[PDB]
Amino acid sequence: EFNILLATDSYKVTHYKQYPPNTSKVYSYFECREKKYEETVFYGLQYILNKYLKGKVVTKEKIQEAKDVYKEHFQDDVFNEKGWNYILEKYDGHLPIEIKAVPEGFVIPRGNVLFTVENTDPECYWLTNWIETILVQSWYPITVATNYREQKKILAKYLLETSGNLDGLEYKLHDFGYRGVSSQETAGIGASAHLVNFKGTDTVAGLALIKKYYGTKDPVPGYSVPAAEHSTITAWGKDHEKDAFEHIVTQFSSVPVSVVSDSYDIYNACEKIWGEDLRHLIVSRSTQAPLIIRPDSGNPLDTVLKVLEILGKKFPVTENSKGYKLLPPYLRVIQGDGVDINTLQEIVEGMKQKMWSIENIAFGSQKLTRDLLNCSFKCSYVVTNGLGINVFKDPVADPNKRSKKGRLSLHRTPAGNFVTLEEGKGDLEEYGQDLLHTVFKNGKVTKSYSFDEIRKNAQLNIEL
Amino acid sequence: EFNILLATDSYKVTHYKQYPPNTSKVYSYFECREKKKYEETVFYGLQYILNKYLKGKVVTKEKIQEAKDVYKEHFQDDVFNEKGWNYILEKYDGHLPIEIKAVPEGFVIPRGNVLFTVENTDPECYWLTNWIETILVQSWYPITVATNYREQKKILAKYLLETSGNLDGLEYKLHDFGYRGVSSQETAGIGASAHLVNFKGTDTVAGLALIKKYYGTKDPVPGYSVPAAEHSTITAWGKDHEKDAFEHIVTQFSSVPVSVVSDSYDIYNACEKIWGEDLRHLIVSRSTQAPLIIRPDSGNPLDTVLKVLEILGKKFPVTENSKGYKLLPPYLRVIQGDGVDINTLQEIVEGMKQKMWSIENIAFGSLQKLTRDLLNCSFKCSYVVTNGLGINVFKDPVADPNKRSKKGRLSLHRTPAGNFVTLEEGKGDLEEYGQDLLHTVFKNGKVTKSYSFDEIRKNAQLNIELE
């Protein structure tokens, strides 16, 4: 079973011995430090609070386990048994910590306080930074939610330009990343962050995480459609690709179906198999049940443009009100190979240049890290001998790693923007009310958001 | 509770209707595909997945009903193969009718070789082989982490041996600091265990618990750490009191090694004036078994290491070892844990060598952008039986010959020169190439062969270490 006492960086076990003696308060904060990606979607802390931090997280058994493990790990006794026993005895294993945070789904410029953490009992001054490691992992859903919002902005721009509207934007970037992430847990978290922005997903795990920790009015937050993979085409044999295609589109004749078409020759498949041999089975399909042709190899832009040029000559194309070419409603394309934010941008611009509407295409979804948005957790205020002091790092060779000082608060500016106030200056009351809310206190979650509210908070300006 | 019926790519739910009718067998394989350098990979991690996710009664009535309910809403249609899963529940008590054969864990195998194969053991479950692709393919991660760290160890070994004349301490030269930097708790355990295949120093205890539960070591633990400061334990003392913080910390940990981050305000002042003057007397009195380890954590990683060494070299007694390289006294060492990937690791050790500093002096602290594409980890169907006829199948996209897959039943063999070769089209059966190196590790819900973490470490050793 999960043990919070074994869920921290090893050296943090030794930190209670390193703070100034008579320290009663340690106060720390998380930011996406300021140096593309000028604003971040704050998302994912609520999962962490609920799965790992709330309730009786300390037991006699868990304390003994940590004692035994650290004894071998450090080859010495350095584990703070007494401190954890205090929390067990005094608070029935609930963490005497208060966490304040911006609402989930909030879109906030870099360099602002997003959450703060402090101990609520003088005896547990060491606890604030013990849980740094776990809370810092929020960088992942934040960065994923953020990156996908940025992709949506690009898609929205180009769909609006080529079509005159945003219809179907939420299905334009489908999550196919399940097998490409590092773990099952990561699959659920990352997919949920994707679903903040889009509705189309092949990663089931996202749906369950959302239902358990956030909640939606609807039965599910995300949807998929039948689709082929290379094995369901190749199993038929190299000479029977046409047979595979006919069987699949016939099995899925009244729902949308995606069919990977590059097993052997994408261009032949589009022009001769779909565009000739099986054409009668495609033109007869309903607008609610299109064939979605999926190329999956080659240069992403060149392949997409050639696939469209091929289909344009085999199927009736219209020109929409904005002047852009549009395939018939029973025929679409999905490109899910090598689509990152850069390649996404190159494809939609390339399509636009060739007078193809973004209506025609969807994308399928990569190496995001903690340094991308500079997600960082730092101590900014401590009380020692009853005196509060503002603390910070400011390394000489890197001004960008300078941290914020003292008690922090988040405020609306007179122009309606965000500003973080340092050194407890929030208390001067010149900038109105703190925009952070208490989300966790003494083992309990004190404020939470539905996934529906999170989606509303994360909307694009163009959608509003 | 984890439901295997919900642990696949959505579209795979629909594949039982797409395979050719009268298909009784689907046979699929995993490789780190060769690309037209990471020329060899450490196979590691499948055993975790087999035990955590695949073995035993993984199908229940409630799990089938849960999946049916979820899929009805997810697809806005009834596409779920309830009958097929019911069959596994009734006929096999919910155990998966699958056989998996794999190269031993820890094995170091050149790119483009079969590493494991998967096939159904019951004709009715032809669809099941690729249902579990998604979960099996996630093995890319421990494979790639274990491989990347082995490659970093190769570089460390080269330079340590050149500048010192031995490999002493090699297993503690790259410490795992990546806990906060990975995507999840589960990833933390898996990634740290793959690090531990190569090294012994770690701050991610998650990896220790995974190894103990899934692999096992003779020793109490596979990995170790020492006390260390963070910016908070230094800055909490106040801007004017860094010296006080340093003195306090080295005195609290006077008899064990201790790492102390020293760049809170000014790394070069801290090294020259605080450690190298004000507190010098507390450092030069330390035991060889209890060095101070100075930790810079900002600035250009090579520039900073070199300047730190130059500073310390002038404040402390340096010797020249038998190879002609400079060596700090034994009570003083440095760890660089900012921005160290494989490229920067090479640049630092090479830069140190050029400035006549031994690698004995330094240790490093560490994925970053490790992905499935790095080693081209891929799972592909290569053989089916339809209407009782075996057919060899594959993909071969016109615009990318690098994505061509292998054909037929596969086997892995030793070449006459002692290398590896994958045999396709069932040609292993000709028995011209000795025994198949793949072993059955999973069959019908049971793990059939397991490896200790001790064996895996043995298998993954460097040639330089064997010599």
Residue numbers in the entry:
A (entry chain B): 8 to 42, 53 to 382, 388 to 486
B (entry chain A): 8 to 43, 53 to 382, 387 to 487
Quote the original article.
NAMPT functions as a homo-dimeric enzyme that catalyzes the rate limiting step in the primary salvage pathway for NAD synthesis, the transfer of a phosphoribosyl residue from 5-phosphoribosyl-1-pyrophosphate (PRPP) to nicotinamide (NAM) to produce nicotinamide mononucleotide (NMN). Crystal structures of NAMPT in numerous ligand-bound forms have been reported. These structures consistently display a NAMPT homo-dimer with two essentially identical active sites at the dimer interface. Typical NAMPT inhibitors were found to occupy the portion of active site responsible for NAM binding and a tunnel-shaped cavity extending from the NAM binding site. Furthermore, we determine the crystal structures of six NAMPT mutants in the apo form and in complex with various inhibitors and present a definitive model to explain the differential effects of the mutations on various structural classes of NAMPT inhibitors.
The crystal structures of NAMPT S165F/Y revealed a somewhat surprising conformational change in a small helical structural motif spans the sequence G383GGLLQ388. We designate this motif as “380GRS” to reflect its position in the primary sequence, and its glycine rich characteristic. The unwinding of the 380GRS in S165 mutants rendered the structure less compatible with the binding of PRPP. Our structural studies thus reveal that the S165 mutation modulates NAMPT activity by interfering with PRPP binding in an allosteric manner. Consistent with the structural observations, S165F/Y mutant NAMPT proteins required approximately 500 fold more PRPP compared to the wild-type protein and the other NAMPT mutants. In all cases the S165Y mutant resulted in greater resistance to NAMPT inhibitors. In contrast, NCI-H460 S165Y tumor xenografts were completely resistant to treatment with GNE-618, even when dosed daily (QD) at higher drug concentrations. Furthermore, xenografts derived from cells harboring the S165Y mutation in NAMPT are resistant to GNE-618 at doses that are efficacious in the parental line, suggesting that this is relevant in vivo.
